[PDB]
């Protein structure tokens, strides 16, 4: 028997919505260690001989995400269900519901790791966005709130 | 003793160390003016009174300026980077001395520093240059 | 104690958030029912026996009163 705050997970986001979430999220990769290093050597070769705006990426640290929700800066928050200590993330759907930040439980922790240059991530969030994907993001917010939140209003109940 | 009996018996020898004279006559090491003016025949406290300098700052338990002037003798006797200087050249030639315009500027003053920061660095720039 | 331990909006939020998400412990599950049926008098008796001192049991029963009143109404 599962106490309602556990198994608020497993009632995860479905097939098509999850695919569309990654269609958005895979656009916003953090610049990998190799890519970042080569860019700075390009900067070294250029600026030593002879401007840029703030670049948007996903935010992916548990401490960083728990900061961003309640900041409030997070817009979408993805949460993996499979976590070795489950108690690490059990409060997080409640925190998002309380602060009114739209969240989604995604399926697979390594699935979050792929979009983020890590092995696993447990939580991923998209704070800010480029102007072109703004309408698409807000549409996905409504899509997730209709599919995830409104269908499973009774997820806080039932063992 | 068991082990000591062998060491006296063996043809290996003992690691003979004569280091009892050095435990008393310690050379001063940290000041050259003192290194010249320090009578080793005298003690620690007697050497301090001979110099002038205090050996103890508290009221001591129990009972009891040629050099100090030379210490007062030795008491009698930072630029900006290339990018920083060249960046300040860009600001000065653009605005002049309008620091309000200079910090509300976006293209040249990228890191949004205050009026006080920019003007201080310009004062240092105006010393090395015009 | 100049730095005694001020309210701190964040800490108050976290404590009350966990207070509901965790649910209720078996003695507290018994205790809240014991308030509604046997009154606050016998509730303080059981809480004093369960916990260490009476000074703990006062603030505990007071916390239960706040939980019950805020749940049913709002």
């Amino acid at each position: 028997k599962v106490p309602p705050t556990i198994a608020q997970f497993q009632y995860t986001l479905d097939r098509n919505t999850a695919a569309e979430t990654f269609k958005l999220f895979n656009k916003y990769r953090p610049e990998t260690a190799a890519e970042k290093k080569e860019r700075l050597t390009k900067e070294a070769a250029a600026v030593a001989e002879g401007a840029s705006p703030k670049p948007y990426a996903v935010k992916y640290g548990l401490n960083h995400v728990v900061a961003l929700i309640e900041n409030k800066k997070a817009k979408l928050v993805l949460i993996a269900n499979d976590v070795d200590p489950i108690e690490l993330v059990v409060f997080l759907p409640a925190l998002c519901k309380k602060m009114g930040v739209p969240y989604a439980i995604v399926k697979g922790k390594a699935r979050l790791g792929t979009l983020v240059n890590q092995k696993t991530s447990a939580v991923a969030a998209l704070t800010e966005v480029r102007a072109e994907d703004e309408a698409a993001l807000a549409k996905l917010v409504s899509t997730i709130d209709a599919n995830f939140a409104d269908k499973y209003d009774e997820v806080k109940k039932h063992w | 003793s068991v082990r000591k009996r062998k060491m006296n018996r063996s043809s290996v020898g003992k690691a003979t160390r004569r280091n009892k004279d050095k435990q008393r006559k310690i050379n001063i090491q940290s000041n050259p003016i003192i290194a010249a003016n320090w009578d080793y025949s005298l003690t620690m406290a007697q050497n301090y009174k001979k110099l002038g300098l205090r050996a103890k700052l508290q009221t001591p338990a129990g009972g009891k300026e040629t050099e100090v002037v030379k210490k007062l003798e030795e008491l009698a006797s930072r630029s900006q980077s290339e990018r920083e200087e060249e960046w300040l050249e860009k600001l000065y030639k653009k605005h002049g001395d309008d620091y309000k315009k200079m910090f509300f500027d976006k293209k040249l003053n990228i890191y949004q520093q205050s009026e006080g920061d920019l003007k201080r660095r310009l004062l240092r720039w105006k010393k090395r240059n015009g | 104690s100049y730095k005694k331990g001020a309210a701190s909006n964040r800490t108050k939020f976290v404590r009350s958030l966990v207070r509901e998400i965790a649910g209720l412990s078996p003695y507290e599950r018994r205790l809240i029912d014991l308030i509604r049926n046997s009154g606050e008098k016998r509730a303080r008796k059981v809480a004093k026996k369960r916990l260490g001192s009476f000074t703990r049991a006062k603030a505990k029963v007071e916390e239960m009163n706040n939980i019950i009143a805020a749940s049913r109404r709002h």
């Binding site: 703030k54 409030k72 519901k97 309380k98 602060m99 | - | 509901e20 749940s71």
Partner: peptide, 26 residues
């Protein structure tokens, strides 16, 4: 029963100023 979270939050839980390091390029 999702009691406390039904009353949805307004100001963030802190009041910390946000530094100049989160504006001019890093």
């Amino acid at each position: 029963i999702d009691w406390f979270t039904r009353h949805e939050e307004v100001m963030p839980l802190t009041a910390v100023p946000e530094p100049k390091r989160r504006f001019v390029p890093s």
